[PDB]
Each structure stands twice: as C-alpha cells, then as structure tokens.
Amino acid sequence: PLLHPERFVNLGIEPPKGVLLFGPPGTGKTLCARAVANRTDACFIRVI
Amino acid sequence: KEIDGRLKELREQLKELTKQYEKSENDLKALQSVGQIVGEVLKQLTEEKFIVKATNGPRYVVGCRRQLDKSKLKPGTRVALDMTTLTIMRYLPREVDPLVYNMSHEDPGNVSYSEIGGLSEQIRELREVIELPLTNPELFQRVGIIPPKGCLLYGPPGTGKTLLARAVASQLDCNFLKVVSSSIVDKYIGESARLIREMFNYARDHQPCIIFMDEIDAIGGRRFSEGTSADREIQRTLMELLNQMDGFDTLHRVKMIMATNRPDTLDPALLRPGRLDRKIHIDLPNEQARLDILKIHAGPITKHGEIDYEAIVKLSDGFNGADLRNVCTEAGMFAIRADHDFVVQEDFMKAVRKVADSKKLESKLDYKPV
Amino acid sequence: KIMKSEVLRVTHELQAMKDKIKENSEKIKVNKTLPYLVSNVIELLDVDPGKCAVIKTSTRQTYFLPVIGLVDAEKLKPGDLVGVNKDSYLILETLPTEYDSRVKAMEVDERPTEQYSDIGGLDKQIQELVEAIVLPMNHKEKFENLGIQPPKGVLMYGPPGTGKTLLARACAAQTKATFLKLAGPQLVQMFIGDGAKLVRDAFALAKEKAPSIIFIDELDAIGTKRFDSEKAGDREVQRTMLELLNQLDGFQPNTQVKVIAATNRVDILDPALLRSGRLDRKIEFPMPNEEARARIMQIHSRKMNVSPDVNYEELARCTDDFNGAQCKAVCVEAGMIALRELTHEDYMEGILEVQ
Ligand SMILES: Nc1ncnc2c1ncn2[C@@H]1O[C@H](COP(=O)(O)OP(=O)(O)OP(=O)(O)O)[C@@H](O)[C@H]1O
Numbered sequence: 001p002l003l004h005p006e007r008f009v010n011l012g013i014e015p016p017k018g019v020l021l022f023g024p025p026g027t028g029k030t031l032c033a034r035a036v037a038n039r040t041d042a043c044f045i046r047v048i
Numbered sequence: 049k050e051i052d053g054r055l056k057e058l059r060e061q062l063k064e065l066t067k068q069y070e071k072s073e074n075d076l077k078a079l080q081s082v083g084q085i086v087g088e089v090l091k092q093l094t095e096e097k098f099i100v101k102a103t104n105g106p107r108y109v110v111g112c113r114r115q116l117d118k119s120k121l122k123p124g125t126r127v128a129l130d131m132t133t134l135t136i137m138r139y140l141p142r143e144v145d146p147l148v149y150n151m152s153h154e155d156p157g158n159v160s161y162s163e164i165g166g167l168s169e170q171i172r173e174l175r176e177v178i179e180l181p182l183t184n185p186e187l188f189q190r191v192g193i194i195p196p197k198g199c200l201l202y203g204p205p206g207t208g209k210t211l212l213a214r215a216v217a218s219q220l221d222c223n224f225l226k227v228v229s230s231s232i233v234d235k236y237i238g239e240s241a242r243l244i245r246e247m248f249n250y251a252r253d254h255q256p257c258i259i260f261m262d263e264i265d266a267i268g269g270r271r272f273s274e275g276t277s278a279d280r281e282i283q284r285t286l287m288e289l290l291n292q293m294d295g296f297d298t299l300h301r302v303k304m305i306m307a308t309n310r311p312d313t314l315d316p317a318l319l320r321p322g323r324l325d326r327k328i329h330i331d332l333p334n335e336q337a338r339l340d341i342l343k344i345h346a347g348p349i350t351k352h353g354e355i356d357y358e359a360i361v362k363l364s365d366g367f368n369g370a371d372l373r374n375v376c377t378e379a380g381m382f383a384i385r386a387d388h389d390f391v392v393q394e395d396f397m398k399a400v401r402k403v404a405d406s407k408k409l410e411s412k413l414d415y416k417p418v
Numbered sequence: 419k420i421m422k423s424e425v426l427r428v429t430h431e432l433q434a435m436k437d438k439i440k441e442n443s444e445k446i447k448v449n450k451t452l453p454y455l456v457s458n459v460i461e462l463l464d465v466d467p468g469k470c471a472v473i474k475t476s477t478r479q480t481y482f483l484p485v486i487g488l489v490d491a492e493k494l495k496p497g498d499l500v501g502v503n504k505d506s507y508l509i510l511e512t513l514p515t516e517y518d519s520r521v522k523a524m525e526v527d528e529r530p531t532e533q534y535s536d537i538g539g540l541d542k543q544i545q546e547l548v549e550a551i552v553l554p555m556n557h558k559e560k561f562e563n564l565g566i567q568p569p570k571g572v573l574m575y576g577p578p579g580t581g582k583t584l585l586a587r588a589c590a591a592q593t594k595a596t597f598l599k600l601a602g603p604q605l606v607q608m609f610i611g612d613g614a615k616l617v618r619d620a621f622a623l624a625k626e627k628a629p630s631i632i633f634i635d636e637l638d639a640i641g642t643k644r645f646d647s648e649k650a651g652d653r654e655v656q657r658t659m660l661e662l663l664n665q666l667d668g669f670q671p672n673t674q675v676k677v678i679a680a681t682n683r684v685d686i687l688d689p690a691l692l693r694s695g696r697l698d699r700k701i702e703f704p705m706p707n708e709e710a711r712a713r714i715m716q717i718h719s720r721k722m723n724v725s726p727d728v729n730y731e732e733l734a735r736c737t738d739d740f741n742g743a744q745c746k747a748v749c750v751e752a753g754m755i756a757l758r759e760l761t762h763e764d765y766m767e768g769i770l771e772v773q
C-alpha cells in the first residue's frame with residue numbers, strides 16, 4: 001500500500017484494512033521496524 | 049373608497065407592530081441599567097444595619113436609606129445591593145426551582161383517570177389520600193388525626209402507573225410537581241441537596257402540592273460495601289432527603305406518590321411506617337379488565353360486529369394493557385397490508401398469536417411481591 | 419377622507435420604529451457579541467406588584483436582572499448557556515447548551531452514506547421497518563393527516579452479523595436526518611446517574627437535531643431479564659433502564675426521533691421495553707440462507723474485479739451457518755489473497771481463521 005502500485009484498480013478499491021503482527025515475546029515489531037526502514041519517511045512511532 | 053380602504057390596510061400592519069421604539073428604549077434602558085448585586089440577609093445587625101451574604105462572595109452589611117420598609121425585611125430575605133449605592137434600592141421575594149418548574153408544569157394533555165380499567169380500588173385509594181384531607185377537614189377534626197402522607201405503587205413494569213401519574217397531574221396542572229429522581233446528579237458537588245431543599249420550600253409555599261417522583265430505587269439502595277465517592281453521594285443525598293421530609297419539621301398538606309420496580313432492594317429506613325403510610329401493589333390486569341382495556345384501545349378502529357373478544361381473553365393471558373395496544377397496532381398494519389379499510393377478526397388472531405409468540409421468549413415477567 | 423394623513427404617519431411610524439431597534443439591537447448585539455457569564459437560571463416568577471431571574475455568572479457572581487429584560491421565559495427555559503450581559507448583567511440571548519461531555523459527540527455520525535442496496539437477505543424485514551421508520555420521516559404528513567401516530571420503538575433482535583447496524587444507518591441516510599449511535603454495552607457507568615445523564619442528553623441532542631434515529635446497541639446488556647440472583651440483581655442498571663423508559667414518551671407529539679434497539683436475544687428483556695407505546699416493532703434477524711448469503715457476499719465483492727464468472731454456488735454450499743459479517747470476511751479474505759484460490763476456492767478459509 002505504501003508503494004501504491006496496484007491497490008486502486010486490480011485489487012478491490014483499498015488494500016487490506018489492517019495488520020495484527022502479534023506473537024510471543026520475540027520477533028514482534030522487528031519486522032515492523034524493517035518495514036519502516038524499507039518504506040518512505042512516513043515512519044512509525046512506538047506507543048505502549 | 050380608495051381614500052378609505054387604503055387606510056384600513058396600513059395601520060393594521062402595525063398595531064402589534066411598530067411596537068419597536070420602546071422595545072429599543074427598554075433594551076437601551078437595560079444597556080445603561082445598573083445591575084444590582086444579590087444576596088441573602090443573614091441577620092439584622094441593628095434597625096438600620098443588616099448582615100447580608102452575597103450568594104458567592106463575603107457577607108456585607110447594608111442599610112435601607114429612607115423608605116425601603118426595613119420591618120418587612122427578615123433574616124434570609126432577598127434584597128438587591130450595589131457596591132456603589134451602599135444601600136438596598138429594592139427587595140425581591142424568592143425562587144421556584146426553574147428546571148423542575150417547567151418539567152413539572154409541562155404535563156401533556158391526558159385522558160381522564162376513568163379511561164383505565166381494573167384499578168378502581170387504586171383510584172379510590174388516590175381519592176381518600178388526596179381529595180379527602182383537603183375537602184373535609186371537619187370530619188378528621190372530629191376524628192382528631194393527621195391525614196396520611198404517602199402511598200407506594202409497585203408491580204410489573206406495565207400497570208398504568210405512568211397513566212395514573214399523568215392523569216392526576218392533568219387533574220390540577222397548576223400545583224402538581226413531577227420529579228423523575230435522576231437529574232439530581234450534576235457536574236458540581238453542590239446543587240444536589242440544594243435543589244431538594246428548594247422545592248420542599250416550594251412545597252412549603254403552596255400547601256396543596258402533590259409531589260410525584262419515580263424510581264426510588266434510583267436513590268434508594270440497600271447498603272454500599274466499599275462505597276465509591278458516587279455511592280457516598282447517594283447516601284448523603286438519601287439522608288438529606290429523609291431528614292427534610294420526615295426530619296424534625298414535617299410538611300403540611302403535601303403528599304408524596306412514588307413508584308418503582310424492585311421493592312426488595314429499597315432501603316428499609318425509608319419504607320417504615322411514618323414515611324410510607326400505605327403500600328399498594330398493582331397486580332396483573334384481570335381478564336375482564338384486559339377486555340375493557342382492549343375495547344378502549346380498539347375504540348376508534350374500523351371494524352364490524354364479528355370480533356371474538358372472548359377468544360382473545362382466553363388466549364391473551366398475563367398481558368398488560370401495553371401488550372393490548374400492540375395487538376391493536378398489529379391488527380392495524382395487518383389491515384394496511386392488502387389495503388383493507390376495515391379490520392377483520394383474523395387480523396386480531398394474527399396479532400394475538402404473534403404477540404403470544406413474542407412473549408414466549410421472555411421469562412421472569414414480574415418480580416415477586418414483598 | 420382620512421387615509422393620506424394616517425399612512426404618512428404609519429409608514430413613517432413603521433420605518434422609524436424598526437430603525438431604532440436596528441440601532442438598539444446593535445447596541446445590545448455587540449453586548450450579545452460580548453457575553454461572558456453563564457446563565458444558571460434560578461428563576462422567580464416575579465409578577466410585578468411578570469417574571470425575573472438569577473444568573474450564576476462564570477466569575478462566581480449572581481445577577482438578578484429584573485423581569486428578564488430581553489428574552490421571553492417561554493423560550494428562555496432554565497438550564498445553562500444562555501447569553502448574559504457582561505456589563506448590563508441581563509439575559510442576552512439563547513445559545514446552544516452543553517451536551518454532557520460524552521454526549522457532545524460520543525460516536526455521532528453527521529450523515530451515513532451506506533445504501534440499502536448493499537444489504538439484503540432479510541428484505542421482508544428491512545422493508546417492514548422502513549415502512550415503520552423511514553416512511554414516518556419522509557411521509558410524516560401522511561400519518562399526520564391520517565390521524566395515526568407512527569410507532570417509534572423498533573427492536574431488531576438476531577445473532578451478530580445480520581446487518582442491523584448497516585440497516586439502521588441506511589435507513590437514517592434514506593430519511594436524510596440526524597443519526598445518533600449509542601454504545602450500549604458501555605453505558606454501564608460506575609458513576610451514579612452517569613448512564614442516566616448520558617441517555618438524557620442523547621435524547622436532548624436528538625430532539626434538538628431533526629427527527630433523529632436513536633440506535634441503541636446491546637439492548638440485552640441494557641436490560642436484564644429480571645432473573646434476580648444476589649450475584650447481580652441489575653440494581654444500578656435498572657436506574658438507566660427506567661430512564662430510557664421515561665424518555666420514550668418525550669417525543670410522542672409530532673412523532674420525531676425514532677428509537678432502534680439492536681440485540682441478539684430478545685428473551686433477555688423483561689416486559690418493560692416491550693411496550694406498545696415503547697419499543698413495539700420487534701423484527702427477527704436470522705442467519706441468511708445459502709441463496710441470501712451468496713448474494714450478500716456477491717454484493718460485497720461487486721467492487722472487486724479479479725475473478726470473472728464466479729457463481730458462488732460452492733460458496734453457498736460451504737457457507738453453512740454464517741453471518742453477513744462472516745460472508746463479508748469471507749469475501750474480503752479473497753480480497754487479501756487474490757493477488758498475482760482466486761475463483762470459487764479462495765473463500766473457505768475465512769471462517770476457519772477466526773477459530
Ligand atoms: N528475527 C530476528 N532477528 C534478529 N533479532 C531479532 C529477531 N527477533 C527479535 N530480535 C531481537 O529481539 C530484541 C527485541 O525484538 P523486538 O523488537 O522484535 O521485540 P520487542 O519490541 O522487544 O517485544 P516482543 O519481544 O514482545 O515482541 C532485539 O534485540 C532484536 O534484535
């Protein structure tokens with residue numbers, strides 16, 4: 001969706017409405033940080 | 049005629065109109081009107097010295113100048129003050145609980161209390177608790193007793209309590225106070241018991257006040273274990289209510305009519321005799337009473353003389369008059385279906401079975417009486 | 419005769435009359451453009467030996483403006499938030515009050531845009547409540563001339579995912595009037611009278627804003643079936659329940675602001691809300707059949723064009739005991755996987771994921 005290459009037409013209107021990246025204490029939110037670095041300057045904030 | 053009829057147009061446009069120059073002056077008069085500060089005279093220091101509490105600020109003392117009738121001023125009277133004119137320029141009576149006033153003086157146009165059937169015993173109970181003490185005090189003078197204070201109504205949520213309360217309210221419509229017993233809560237810590245004392249004072253002003261408040265269980269409670277600050281505000285509000293209605297000084301010609309749904313959870317301190325003189329349970333409507341209510345609800349209905357009312361009575365059981373206008377309604381848009389001018393008995397049968405199947409689902413239709 | 423003298427006075431006396439209030443109004447409207455003190459009306463019906471007022475000012479003061487020199491007490495009913503002169507210490511003009519913090523905007527949607535076409539399956543029921551709610555809005559004058567006051571309380575009971583929320587909002591959109599949504603399961607407040615206060619200002623807000631749609635959810639949570647055990651006797655929630663009861667008759671004249679209560683099991687209610695003048699229209703919301711479920715998900719996936727010619731018949735066979743919400747989740751699950759299954763086989767796993 002951040003690349004916005006195909007969300008508008010080929011797939012239905014909008015990309016999937018959300019992500020729940022859960023899991024036991026471990027890899028959780030590290031993939032989020034990796035996605036943040038791989039994406040544009042619209043970068044995440046870690047709220048508790 | 050042209051010089052006649054053209055006149056009759058132009059002055060009528062005004063009359064009530066062209067009533068603006070003085071309205072303008074009045075609001076200009078307001079523009080340079082002095083706003084006089086308002087307090088309550090706690091006590092009279094001397095014949096010319098009067099100790100007055102500003103409703104918010106400190107107690108000042110003021111003094112009537114020449115003709116303000118210092119004799120009629122009393123400790124606790126309302127007077128207008130000015131931080132500049134040094135005196136009282138005029139005196140002012142009291143207040144009337146405005147929020148309560150309009151919601152107690154906006155009783156909608158109801159029908160007579162004779163339009164509800166099966167509660168004639170409750171009707172005569174209301175007559176010999178309200179009308180009798182004021183119409184004939186000579187008989188009770190020969191008796192030598194005080195009239196009773198209040199009566200309680202309780203039972204299934206559908207009885208006619210709101211209809212009876214609205215009917216007795218429509219009987220007077222001038223000295224009847226309605227209370228819903230839930231607007232007592234507010235943002236501020238104050239104005240909780242202040243209002244309660246205020247319409248009690250209003251009940252002191254007018255002797256034949258009939259006070260009606262509903263859901264005593266909304267303030268009652270049994271006992272609060274590990275009470276919260278909101279729970280603690282109930283118990284002081286309940287205690288203030290108790291000591292202002294029974295307390296040390298009693299009311300005169302003021303009767304309280306209250307209703308609820310859970311009699312067991314009520315606080316035993318309130319329901320003891322002396323505060324609640326009579327307890328009345330409004331039971332299930334009778335089968336012939338349900339027949340009368342059905343006829344009342346089916347009065348202005350286009351129908352012919354084939355309706356089996358006895359069949360409705362046999363099938364519809366345990367159904368308050370509430371469920372009966374449902375049946376009358378359900379026959380209504382059944383008649384709307386297929387565009388039928390009249391209402392057929394089959395529509396009532398469809399209504400009865402649909403309401404009966406509706407009522408099957410719900411259990412515990414009524415609390416057991418105390 | 420005597421016209422030409424009369425009107426040369428009259429038209430002059432008309433225009434000069436109105437000009438001075440135009441002056442005066444300005445002289446008081448700038449003051450009305452600078453009010454500073456809230457109006458905690460503590461009224462006296464002070465008949466002049468007509469009325470009068472006490473105003474608890476914002477700065478903690480009280481001002482007894484005589485006979486309320488500007489606003490009639492018929493419209494100046496007591497309350498708060500009504501213009502008061504900052505200099506003249508007089509009532510200035512009415513203004514909107516405060517809607518009890520939470521009720522100011524709890525979840526109030528200004529205008530819903532969901533359409534009636536995207537919902538279906540229970541078309542007989544949806545048309546039934548449209549006749550009982552939407553028609554009393556658009557053709558309200560038809561009921562007025564007929565003489566029958568439309569019923570207001572519609573109770574829509576059925577397992578979750580039957581489209582009650584969409585139908586209520588779609589009906590509100592069709593009426594083109596105000597829609598107010600109540601979070602029913604969260605009306606149980608530890609503060610005393612809080613839920614009672616919330617429902618009041620919700621009714622007050624609905625009355626002040628058009629013939630509205632009061633969509634109270636979780637009526638079973640609001641009202642217990644009176645099955646009284648000491649574990650919980652529904653003591654503090656009976657507070658709010660009868661409060662909702664006494665506000666159901668507030669809008670009986672002029673028949674505006676309808677009440678729509680959504681729940682799953684109607685049997686968990688005592689015969690209090692099931693009243694003819696109160697909630698009377700109970701409409702069943704069953705789980706849609708295979709045809710209806712297939713049509714519902716087809717309408718949901720109408721905005722998706724990835725897999726042509728999917729009759730959804732195998733989906734209807736595999737959509738046993740599923741809700742419209744489950745059908746939407748099934749179709750959007752395809753909307754998440756149908757990248758680069760696809761046809762008649764990317765639908766089953768949606769239900770399997772939730773459990
Ligand atoms: N796949 C991984 N590769 C490398 N390091 C990882 C990986 N998963 C977790 N870690 C390490 O784990 C630590 C915290 O991981 P992460 O930020 O994902 O979790 P968190 O925010 O601390 O919470 P939780 O463990 O509950 O998900 C970091 O030091 C990170 O390097």
Ligand SMILES: Nc1ncnc2c1ncn2[C@@H]1O[C@H](COP(=O)(O)OP(=O)(O)O)[C@@H](O)[C@H]1O
Pocket residue numbers: 163164165166204205206207208209210211212333341344368369370373693694695
């Ligand atoms: N005994 C009765 N006679 C006539 N109508 C009744 C009766 N009981 C209930 N109703 C119907 O119920 C509605 C009034 O509600 P009500 O039962 O008075 O509330 P509550 O019982 O909480 O006071 C009215 O529409 C009225 O037609």
Ligand SMILES: Nc1ncnc2c1ncn2[C@@H]1O[C@H](COP(=O)(O)OP(=O)(O)O)[C@@H](O)[C@H]1O
Pocket residue numbers: 536537538539576577578579580581582583584680703714741742743744746
């Ligand atoms: N007939 C229908 N048409 C379209 N969507 C529906 C339908 N029925 C249910 N839904 C879906 O169900 C969801 C509403 O769920 P919810 O309001 O919790 O169910 P209920 O109203 O039965 O309690 C919506 O997001 C909607 O997509």
